[PDB]
């Protein structure tokens, strides 16, 4: 029976590492990328946010939770559903939690991890304030010494409830805006609670990919190195590629779903519009390479064909292809750093994506 | 090798028949079910009128043909395309053809031939007027003369073109309104000029099942019973069981699609609305009985989730489930006449279809 939650280093290159998370319900090979779960993957992204106002959460448990709801058996990771009532509900926060509206709600770092009980997710987030940027030193860190005490009710909350403790993992989010600091301080919070994974939070939200590697120049070696790190919101293949470089093993990102509903496809020579009128007589597959199943059926013609018509299969094709796409990222990028050559694999990668 | 175009009837029950087309590029099995291509199926649909305007028939005869463009190597059959403009084009008639509208556009008898062979379609329809209901009877007299003489230059233009002739199929359309005198002088005439199959037209167009169904008792008896009889826009399952019972082999419809975006599915039950509130705990699959993929790992509960969140997933899905409880029905009917028990699945389906 594989445990609860090991995380194994098998290889690693500068401050990049590659190996294995294992849980209960799966293995994850990192670094991973975690597609959400309604658009191969070793974990899906649950969304907390939206499955607490439908169906609602006790709801979800009344059908057997969400593995048995969405016919998903592996890993799923749920986020704390602050982040998401920040960017999309009026809201009151308080030191407690936050209320946010047709019926009122409540979210607080309790009723979070209840959520998250709830759902049933494998890996669980604590229940964070992302704060905004830019801020201020000050803002920075009330904010982030409200998170850290909400990091330990996020703790003691997920401790209680034993099928949880037993069966599930805890990552606590470090934030700290782009202050080295406050990250430091942030870091020795989370550590001291401790914490089965350890995410960035705070970034990917509007800072820019030189301002997001330069805080995580400083504030991943902050983090336990023998534990996962998570870049929350992260992101773009060239933000995963210079991520990784830095210490980071698993990502999330609205990209590829976003992208393959508007008509971009990721290629590995940068994205493609696929809706231009460039792409009407092109033969060739969304990328050339790309061992998915629609590049090895269907032209970007065809595709271009059926989004201009407004076709939901296009739309269907495009996704698969970018989820795929990002698989194939991460398997190269995992297999690189394995053999020794994730440096050189970067700027090639680099070298193509932007010509 | 399979021949250009043979059909042999295996087995019948009264007016109903079940049996096979061979052509080149395959088998059909009859009564047969063609979905459309952009949506298991022996034959899909291509779709000449938006085809010709977008990319234009020239551009996929230079990108392959329509099998190579969508990447299905077995039969495509098309319309003809003077149906689709007179439902969505500012027209003008004439004895030539019809003009429509930027850029202007003809159909003629040799235009449209030369569309579905530039397409390079398997079965090609004759370019006929679909007359509107209700009409007088001088003028479903009128319209169906015209169609008649359109549908000589039809064979002419189709018999001109050797690859086409050589390769492909051509199926005459009955016209004649709800008239018995003008569908038998629209049959005479068609066998006359001589076709490979014989679709009944000018029905689906408003006419309701109970006059449709009177039509067909006494259209299709007319038509040479060695060749199959395709009726055009036909149907939601409980017209397709009753045009069975009537002698028809091939049907078409936009229902599983179109319905498969809005929200319905079909069941042996009757259609259900996914979007109702009624399905929000319903662990059940789609339909009980059904061996779709979709049925066999999601619930009515977790669709019906997708849908009201917007998710692509939850159509394609439907639509999934649609075709596929569209072929389900078609085996069925095709088992029940070849065992002799045809009369009493249609009773059965009827009784359970509309509890
Ligand atoms: C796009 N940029 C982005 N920056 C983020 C920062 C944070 C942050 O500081 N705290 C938390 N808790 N989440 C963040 C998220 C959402 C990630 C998520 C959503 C849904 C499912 C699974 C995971 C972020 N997303
Ligand atoms: C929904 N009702 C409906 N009644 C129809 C009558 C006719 C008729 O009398 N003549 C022709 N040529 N077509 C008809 C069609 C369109 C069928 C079609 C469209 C697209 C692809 C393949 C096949 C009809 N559809
Ligand atoms: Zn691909
Ligand atoms: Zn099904």
Redesign the interface.
Known sequence: DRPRFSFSIAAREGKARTGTIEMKRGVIRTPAFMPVG??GADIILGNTY?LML??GAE?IA???GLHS???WDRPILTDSGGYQVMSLSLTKQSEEGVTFKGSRHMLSPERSIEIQHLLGSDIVMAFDECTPYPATPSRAASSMERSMRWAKRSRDAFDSRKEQAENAALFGIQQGSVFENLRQQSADALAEIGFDGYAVGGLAVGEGQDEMFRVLDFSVPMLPDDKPHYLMGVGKPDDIVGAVERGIDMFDCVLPTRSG?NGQAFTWDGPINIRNARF??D?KPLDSECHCAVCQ???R??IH??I??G???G??LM?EHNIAFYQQLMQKIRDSISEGRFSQFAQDFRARYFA
């Open positions: 309604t658009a939206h439908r169906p709801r009344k059908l057997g709801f969405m016919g509903r009407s007589e033969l059926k269907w032209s013609a065809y064909h059926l201009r018509a076709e939901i299969l739309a269907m996704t």
